[PDB]
RNA sequence: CAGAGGUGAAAUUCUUAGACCGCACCAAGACGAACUACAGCGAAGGCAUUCUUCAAGGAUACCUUCCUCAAUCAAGAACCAAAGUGUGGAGAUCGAAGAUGAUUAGAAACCAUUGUAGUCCACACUGCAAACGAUGACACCCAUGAAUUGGGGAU
RNA sequence: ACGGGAAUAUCCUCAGCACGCACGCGAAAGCUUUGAGGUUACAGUCUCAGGGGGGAGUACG
RNA sequence: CGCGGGGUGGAGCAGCCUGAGCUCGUCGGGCUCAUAACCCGAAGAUCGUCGGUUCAAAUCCGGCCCCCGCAACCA
RNA sequence: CACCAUGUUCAA
């Protein structure tokens, strides 16, 4: 896994990973717009369709 | 350049220290001028009294009344 | 002003310092026991 | 301390309602409850009369026939803005129970 | 040219004039009856330099003046006025700027039609800026 | 402020040369035809001008629309809506009427109770409106009392009667005649001397009328409507 | 098309990638202006668009019924603005905390631009208000003028 | 047609929120059939609270 | 001990790449009944110390007196 | 509607 391992249990690089990561690297927060708790109002998630 | 007006009325000094003269002024032109007869009021620097002139230059500001 | 010599501070803020005072009172009686 | 006024400042008798829904001032925006603010109804004239005069002039539609159009506004004020504007001001004690149940 | 509709001369062509006039600007803004297309648009902004002379009598004149200058080469002759103030939840008083943009337009030399004020009013509305107390100043 | 803009662009021809005028035109119930001029972009590439000029709303005063009326006309304004582009003719259909803000203002009183009522109603031709009708109480000439105000089962009365009356008179007319009985006032007059009865009245008046959903455009509907439409000499050579 | 916003004056802010402004719309959540009053209703807290509905409630009217069944109340019970708490919704506006810009000797205040929790709804808690008429409830007597809300009687 | 209707006018009446208005009362401000009146000439009935200012609506339970 | 950084007006800090500035502080005069705030002025260095080079050293290169860090690991 | 902070202890 690439968050195994260290000294300390901790994932030393940032959890948002590429929509164009491949498999086995795309792990964590894929293609994560924005993170940490929300407030102010729960958007609507999913792929934006304008139509 | 500068239209002459006469003070046919003097309103009364007004602002702080009494410096100045709030006065009606009739604009003087000749007969069919759009000008003729219009009454406007004005504020004056200076000593000024019924009956003096003044040299305008524009017209078309109005003192606000006080 | 609507009312009369206090002979003190606001009594609304006198009453939230006692407030406060009372809540650290219980908690340090809480740590003890 | 003393208890300036009958009605406390307010058209509420003491058994009529318990609540009336505030507010906000003309000027500041604080809320008052609206048997309390100084309320005014207010017709102003859209112009003065010079600048009156001038439009009539160039206006085909108003002249002496027809007049011009007025403002209508309800602006109630909070005490403190009622005071500051001059609309309201501190009467002697005795000058204080003289009521006006129409604009003059 | 003149850009003028096919008109005899001396007939009156139509346009609305919108000012909207609060305590930090004027906008002196002619369109047609439909208030679609716009034909010119000068606020005092556009005619000072200092923010505070925005709003001035003085500013919302000279708007209109060039108001009245563009109005004659697009080929309007004559305003309908609509007036507004901020209106809204804020304050319903006309700006300063009000009375002087429309004694410039017929000063001018621009006829001017029918005259409302069309302030936003709310049939109750949402609660106004400030707190319950008001701004203290 | 002149002179004061930073940031322009955030990233580092004569207008009325390219405007064709148009005419406004009213629906015939209407004696001045040609109301209001405008202005449209000349048709370039796929954008069409009629496309872009169908659906815009103009609003002129009624007493301009209709000459010799009087001044109770002068405070009402009615709204068109431009449904045909036909050469430089803008061909419109009534979109709502409404009484100016001035007026209205000034027909409240405080020591008397205002009635609103809100009736909607379908017309012959599938046009649904919305009506809007306002009444105040009045003193009588004797009345010494220092207010007015109504029993509430009088009020939901007067409501119902106009409610009543404003379907029956409007349900089974064309949008046309709807027009002409709205705007020369004579449901007005109906209102008011039928009303009069379940409650004194100082004055009863429509103050809004809107169009809230319109059948599918017909041409030969609109045709009709406009009867015999005056020429437009706007693309015509100067 | 070149500014807009905001202020005592400004700046934070928005803006040729088109802001502000104009017209007609669409969406969503609040709110029910003017009329609105020393006016109404409610035990208090509280309550304001229309229509359709569900149980109430006071007053008035009566040559109806009844027959002391009442008054006030430790204990006990239910309700109780705002803020606050829990779980779901909702989130337009305003806005504790916070952020930035001003003012100031300082200003982590008042002012300006923002903004979280909230503000709104359902259900369940909380029962701390200048919850004020700072005036306990029931009953009796009590002089004068002009009004006002509701129901009756007379012309 | 919510129609033998609706609202006014004069008078009477019961119930309600009140206003300017005589006794009397109160340290006074003021209250006054809406008492804070009818009380040293002190007793209609019931009930809650107060006993110089602070400490304090705090500490403990 | 090895490597690196730093000693500048009373305080903190620039300039540290040859020919002294910033804020506060202090002094004098105003304003105030007086103090503070505010306004007008003035003074205060020898660039830690000792040498060398250079026509000229806060500056450039050496040693010294101190100050502050990074390292001092495998058994 | 820029910005106005402070005045040692008794006693005349
Ligand atoms: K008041
Ligand atoms: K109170
Ligand atoms: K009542
Ligand atoms: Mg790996
Ligand atoms: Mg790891
Ligand atoms: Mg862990
Ligand atoms: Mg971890
Ligand atoms: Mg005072
Ligand atoms: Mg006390
Ligand atoms: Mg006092
Ligand atoms: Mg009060
Ligand atoms: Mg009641
Ligand atoms: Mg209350
Ligand atoms: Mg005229
Ligand atoms: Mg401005
Ligand atoms: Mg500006
Ligand atoms: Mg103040
Ligand atoms: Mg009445
Ligand atoms: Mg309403
Ligand atoms: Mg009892
Ligand atoms: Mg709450
Ligand atoms: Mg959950
Ligand atoms: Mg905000
Ligand atoms: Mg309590
Ligand atoms: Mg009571
Ligand atoms: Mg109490
Ligand atoms: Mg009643
Ligand atoms: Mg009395
Ligand atoms: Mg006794
Ligand atoms: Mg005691
Ligand atoms: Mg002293
Ligand atoms: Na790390
Ligand atoms: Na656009
Ligand atoms: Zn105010």
Redesign the pocket.
Known sequence: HPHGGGNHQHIGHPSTVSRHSPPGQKVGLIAARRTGR?????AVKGAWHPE | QAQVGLIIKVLGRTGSRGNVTQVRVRLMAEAGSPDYNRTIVRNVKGPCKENDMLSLMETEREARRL | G??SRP??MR?KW??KR??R??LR??RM?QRSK | ???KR???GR???????????P?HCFN?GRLTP??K?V?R?VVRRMLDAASARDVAEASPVYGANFPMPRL?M?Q?FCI??AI?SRTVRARP?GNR?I?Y?KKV | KAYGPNVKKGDLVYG?V?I?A????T?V?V?DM?????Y???????KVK??????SPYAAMMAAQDVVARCKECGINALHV?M?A?GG??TKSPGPGAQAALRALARAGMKIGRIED?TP???????????R????? | ????????????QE?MARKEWYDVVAPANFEKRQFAKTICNKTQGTRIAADVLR???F?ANLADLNQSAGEEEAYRKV?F?VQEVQGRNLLTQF??MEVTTDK??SL???????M???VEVKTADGYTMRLFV?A?TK?????????????Q?????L???I??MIKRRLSKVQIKEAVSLLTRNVLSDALVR?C?????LRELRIRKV?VVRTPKFDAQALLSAHGTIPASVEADQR
């Not at chain 5, 200092?50 to 709003?55: I, N, P, T």
């Not at chain 6, 009069?196 to 004194?200: D, H, M, R, S, T």
């Open positions: 929300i407030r102010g109002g729960k | 609507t009312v002979r003190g009594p006198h009453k006692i407030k005072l009372k009172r219980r009686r | 301390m003393t208890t009958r009605n406390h058209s509420k008798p003491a058994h009529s309602r318990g609540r009336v829904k507010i500041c609206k048997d603010a309320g109804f209508y309800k109630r403190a803005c500051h004690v129970k009521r149940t | 609305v919108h909207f609060s305590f930090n600007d906008f803004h369109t439909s208030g679609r297309e716009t010119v648009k000068v606020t005092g902004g556009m200092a923010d505070r002379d925005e709003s609509k507004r901020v939840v804020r069309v009013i709310p049939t109750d509305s949402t609660r106004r800026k400030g707190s107390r008001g701004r203290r100043l | 402020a002149l002179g004061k803009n930073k940031r322009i662009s955030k990233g580092g207008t659906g815009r709303v609003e709204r809506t979109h709502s209205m203002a409240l009183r405080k020591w008397c109770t205002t609103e009522t809100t306002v105040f003193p009588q000439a004797n009345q010494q009392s220092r207010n007015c105000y109504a029993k089962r009088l009020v939901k009365w409501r119902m009667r409610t009543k039928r009069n009865p379940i409650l004194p809107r």
